[PDB]
Design goal:
2 copies of one chain form a homodimer.
Chain A: H1 4-20, H2 28-52, H3 54-81
Helix pairs in contact in A: 1-2
PDB class: protein binding
Keywords: Focal adhesion, Cortical microtubule stabilizing complex, protein binding
Assembly: dimeric
Amino acid sequence: MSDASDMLAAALEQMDGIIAGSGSGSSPMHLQHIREQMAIALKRLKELEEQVRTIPVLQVKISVLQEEKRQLVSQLKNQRAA
Amino acid sequence: SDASDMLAAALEQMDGIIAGSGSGSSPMHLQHIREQMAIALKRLKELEEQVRTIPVLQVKISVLQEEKRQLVSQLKNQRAASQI
């Protein structure tokens, strides 16, 4: 359970408070704090962008196993027929 | 979609403001950073939901592999009876 989405939501909320506060809160610490949270979210985002690339691969691997199973089933059925 | 690029861009502008390398820190610039962060968050949540399917697909792979091993053993048993 990654907290990345919550850290980005939190940094987004602070950013909204600064924008609605006419740039107040743009302190070096607060900007660095928001920055660090943005970095956590980005790193998790890139890991997820790589992960979802594997879903199409897993789906084809499943179709391969289904065809391999299907060929075994037909051979088993024919042998059981005679 | 391109949200990871938008967040990287917002990170670069934020670092340009923090380091003082001429990147603009007006409310407009902060507004632009905000909007990029918002798109990235929406994409991030969508991806957190998507990757949950990977354990499900992997179980489907393990189930099919087990079914194959069991079909092989029945096929060997049945190829023997066909000689009777």
